[PDB]
Amino acid sequence: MMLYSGRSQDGSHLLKSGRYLQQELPVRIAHRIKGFRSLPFIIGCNPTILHVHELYIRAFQKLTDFPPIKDQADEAQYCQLVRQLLDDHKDVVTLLAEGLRESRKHIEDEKLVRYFLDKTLTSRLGIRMLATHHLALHEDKPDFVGIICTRLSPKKIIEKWVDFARRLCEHKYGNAPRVRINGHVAARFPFIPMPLDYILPELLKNAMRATMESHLDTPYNVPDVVITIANNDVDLIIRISDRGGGIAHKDLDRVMDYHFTTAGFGFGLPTSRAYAEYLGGSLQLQSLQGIGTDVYLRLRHIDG
Amino acid sequence: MMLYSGRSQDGSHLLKSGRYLQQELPVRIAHRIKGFRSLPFIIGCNPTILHVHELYIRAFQKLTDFPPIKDQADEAQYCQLVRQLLDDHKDVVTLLAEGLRESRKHIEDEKLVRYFLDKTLTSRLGIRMLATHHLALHEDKPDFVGIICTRLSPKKIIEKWVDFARRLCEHKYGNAPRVRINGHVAARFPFIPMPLDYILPELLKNAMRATMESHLDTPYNVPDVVITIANNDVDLIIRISDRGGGIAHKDLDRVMDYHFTTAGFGFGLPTSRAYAEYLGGSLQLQSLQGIGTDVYLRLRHIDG
Ligand SMILES: Nc1ncnc2c1ncn2[C@@H]1O[C@H](COP(=O)(O)OP(=O)(O)O)[C@@H](O)[C@H]1O
């Protein structure tokens, strides 16, 4: 999958981009439909799963019904369709979580659901990146070409999600750990924010929850979460280290399972890992039981 | 393999211990000999490998020639033999490193040498622990039963090796990183020091070297190495985190190979990992290229 960095004045690059998207979306949607068609019958019969299955069929129908893009007029209407579909599918992760929660227990092969979700969610991420990139090409935001930030600061985007997670945490516990950021705090490079926008708040919420729940006696005084940025020519590494007591030995093999939670659907970790690996990186956990957890997010730098 | 914690007044436990050792050593030595007999011919013909092979045969001969232990008089002489053998074999790791260094290049299957060394070095560690434990049973050291410390402080033993590594480092570079220790600094529990005595200085030397070599402009002012102790009911975790620049992507798949070094034989990491895993734990590396490395040593608590 490619994100067109091309720019032009007649607006021809918008046409080429739209034509590529028009070519690409139906194919990738068809792959998701095949995934639904191959789900174990008893899972596929779940009304929420069926609802999502039908959304995808409906998406494929609308996309294939759209005439080949001939001019900017057509391209403009196609963008309307894509916006509609993006919105129609915005709750898909949540619907799948819900539909699978109970139903998947009716199945011996637990590998199956994991594979279906990894494949379905990462293909969806890719689909949404492509579509959103095309739409964003019409925008005149500085330092962006579509959804590509030409000079992303890891520190800045981390801070954005830190403020977000801290507010959620303060609402629930009356306080939140402070976050310190160190390492390559001045790094700036071309990068696509979207996956960080998913992953970072998931990891931050986990770290803050763990910290508060292990400090119930001193909610007014909890250990900082410490984030380290390492930027090299190959990848970006973001280490998130907390003193929230660690992931217990008895839970460790379970925490990367969809649905597993000690508490919201238990999707944060497996989804984040699937996204990271889909993009050529990884997500690794180091548990110091009794002390805390280090989470390492790695993402490959831009292929230009 | 079992370390007899039994104690008695007639000195009968020394007899039982000796009889067990007399039973156990020849068998385990015979296994090492089989390992030499199965080495690729061209490696087995290396004169240094042949020398080590012959040492093991000679060990097996002496052990099997020793009459069955009947009384404390016999047990005492057996201890003399064991002391001799421990001393005769003290340079074995170094001889194997040397004999294998070139010779192993004459071999397609690089898996072979790794397996031979993992197996040979860990079996040897076990053999030396057992023998040294028996000898130590004659000692009256407080807080020890043989080589088992009844109340080991991880902080204390870490500090011992910190002082050791720092002196080596200062000798070579004119300075050494300071080391801070945090987490469960007051932990005390029954534990066998011997494996830590191998592993800790290896990891500390790596961390200090990396730190000095990445700070050649400011040898008088280098970042601390930070060690975190986590003690729980399952394992002991010792995390050693440095700011020495990390292990490069191009080296990462090689650093756990025997002989691989960027500089002394390149044995520190693979040996430490083999020892940790032999004892039911592990050794894991997290590289933040451009920033530093976290090394996680885990060792299972005592099985009583
Ligand atoms: N930093 C952490 N410290 C301690 N436990 C954690 C941490 N991160 C995740 N976990 C554990 O992993 C489980 C799975 O996390 P996740 O997939 O994000 O789902 P959720 O947060 O919805 O439970 C959590 O319920 C929690 O028990």
Ligand SMILES: Nc1ncnc2c1ncn2[C@@H]1O[C@H](COP(=O)(O)OP(=O)(O)O)[C@@H](O)[C@H]1O
């Ligand atoms: N903490 C560290 N930081 C950077 N590089 C490291 C670190 N630890 C190990 N290495 C790399 O791994 C290689 C292998 O280490 P090791 O097996 O201990 O052998 P040696 O120290 O003899 O080279 C080292 O040469 C070094 O390049």
Ligand SMILES: CC(C)CC(=O)C(=O)O
């Ligand atoms: C292009 C849309 C159908 C978006 C999509 O695939 C999804 O979010 O599920």
Ligand SMILES: CC(C)CC(=O)C(=O)O
């Ligand atoms: C008992 C000894 C022979 C010691 C040993 O096996 C060794 O160190 O190689």
Ligand SMILES: [K+]
């Ligand atoms: K989970």
Ligand SMILES: [K+]
């Ligand atoms: K090595």
Ligand SMILES: [Mg+2]
């Ligand atoms: Mg979560």
Ligand SMILES: [Mg+2]
């Ligand atoms: Mg070393």
